[PDB]
Structure formats: C-alpha cells, structure tokens
Design a protein around this ligand. Structure first.
Ligand SMILES: [Ca+2]
Ligand SMILES: [Ca+2]
Ligand SMILES: [Ca+2]
Ligand SMILES: [Zn+2]
Ligand SMILES: [Zn+2]
Length: 158
C-alpha cells in the first residue's frame, strides 16, 4: 500500500484531550513515534503551526471524515494511511478515557498502533503484535514490538 516517500515526517497535536495533563499527551505521542523511529529511517518532529504530515486529533462522534466515532468503547481511534491532506492523520475517540496507565484506555499503546497505520501498516493476526486489531493493555514499561510488526514496517521502509 502507500508509504511516505521522505525521511523527515512532522506531526502536529491539533487539540488535547482534557483526560490527561498536556505534557503527558506530548510524552505519550512522542514515545509512540519513537517506537517506529527505532526500527526505520524515519525522523519525526512535533510542529506547532502550519500543516504537518500527521495531524493528531481528539474528536467524538461525527467529526468530518466519513468515519464517525461511536461513544465510549467500540472503536478507540483510527488513522489514515500515507498521503496528502487527511492521509496520515490519526484520530482518537474523545468518548474514551485516555491515560498514562492501566486505567481507561492507554494513549501510548493506542498511538503506537494508529501511527503504524499512519505509516502504511494494516492489521496483524498475531495477538503478540502491536498491529493486532484488538486493544490489550500491557505494562507500558514491558512494551515491545513483535517480530511481526518489525517485519511489517521493514517491508515498507528501510
Ligand atoms: Ca495528513
Ligand atoms: Ca468509541
Ligand atoms: Ca475523554
Ligand atoms: Zn476520524
Ligand atoms: Zn488498527
């Protein structure tokens, strides 16, 4: 499928969930980009104005794309594959309760998976994989990409 054809990719946090401290959102998203930068030639920078490649949005219900959120539970987040405009953009359902920990829905773990999609990855059938379709909490300290994820992103970049 489509991939970014450049090595420097920008993101921009369009708005912040009131569920968390600002700095914890910055840090969760940062760390999630770091997971993918560790295993590709990509570099990610946060920008604050202008157009970024990857816009990070917290939104609820119908939010102007053709993919409405469904209130609490069900769909947690989604993201569009690489491309201009909405391409790359990662959207997080505000009707979830985002956290740094095991409570509600972990921002970090979720953003690692959605970013995988922003990068062009689809879903893995391996329950060990971060690209597995279902959200499973794991200790954010114990977190690793599976062989399958690494293999999938390396078939796309690097
Ligand atoms: Ca975009
Ligand atoms: Ca939802
Ligand atoms: Ca919320
Ligand atoms: Zn959306
Ligand atoms: Zn997914």
């Amino acid at each position: 499928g489509p991939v970014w054809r450049k090595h420097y990719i920008t993101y921009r946090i369009n708005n912040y969930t009131p569920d968390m401290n600002r700095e914890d959102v910055d840090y969760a998203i940062r760390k999630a980009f770091q997971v993918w930068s560790n295993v590709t030639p990509l570099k990610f920078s946060k920008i604050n104005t202008g157009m970024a490649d990857i816009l990070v949005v917290f939104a609820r219900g119908a939010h102007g794309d053709d993919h409405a959120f469904d209130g609490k539970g069900g769909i947690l987040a989604h993201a569009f594959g690489p491309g201009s405009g909405i391409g790359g953009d990662a959207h997080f359902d505000e009707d979830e309760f985002w956290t740094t920990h095991s409570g509600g829905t972990n921002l970090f773990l979720t953003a690692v998976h959605e970013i995988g999609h922003s990068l062009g990855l689809g879903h893995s059938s391996d329950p060990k994989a971060v690209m597995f379709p279902t959200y499973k909490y794991v200790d954010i300290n114990t977190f690793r990409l599976s062989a399958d994820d690494i293999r999938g992103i390396q078939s796309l970049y690097g």
